[PDB]
Amino acid sequence: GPKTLHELLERIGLEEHTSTLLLNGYQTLEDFKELRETHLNELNIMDPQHRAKLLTAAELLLDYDTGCE
Amino acid sequence: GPKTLHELLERIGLEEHTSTLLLNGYQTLEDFKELRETHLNELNIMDPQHRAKLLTAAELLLDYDTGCE
């Protein structure tokens, strides 16, 4: 159960890009839930499947931010 | 905010495979959180980025199942 941005990247297997997110202002799950593919374009994360993971993570974090059932 | 499997697939943009999950026994988020790439191999979801999304969704659903903060 990730509580921080870093942990979330570790969760999905993109901890290789934790710094990428972090440096681009994505320091929290609240930031990462705003992360989009168009943003990965900016972050220069052209890694296709890695993108797909990052986006999906952001998708779910936007709704599943542990805000109870 | 998806409460069901179908909605989750819609969330990540893999509603094309909702039936795939559903038919393979993934009818709930509780099922999908067990969804792995090796499973997509079985579901014949060789769609690389789609896989990546599906897996990430399963990753996050496993921890972020709206079980509060």
Picking from A24, A25, A12, the residue whose alpha carbon sits closest to that of residue A51 is A12
CB B35 within 8 A of CB B58: yes
- Specify the fold of A1-69: DNA polymerase; domain 1 (1.10.150)
Task: Report yes or no: A38 at the B interface, CB cutoff 8 Å.
Answer: no
Burial bucket for residue B23 (CB in 10 Å: 0-12, 13-18, 19+): exposed
Q: Which residues contact A5 (CB under 8 A, 6 or more apart)?
A: A18, A21, A22, A26, A27, A28, A29, A31, A32
The experimental technique used to determine this model is: NMR
Task: Report yes or no: B42 at the A interface, CB cutoff 8 Å.
Answer: no
CB A55 within 8 A of CB A17: no
Interface contact flag, A53 B53, Cβ < 8 Å: yes
Give residue limits of the domains in chain A: 1-69
Structure tokens at A49: 């499947």
CB A1 within 8 A of CB B66: no
Amino acid at B54: L
Interface contact flag, B66 A61, Cβ < 8 Å: no
Structure tokens at B1: 């905010």
Interface contact flag, B52 A57, Cβ < 8 Å: no
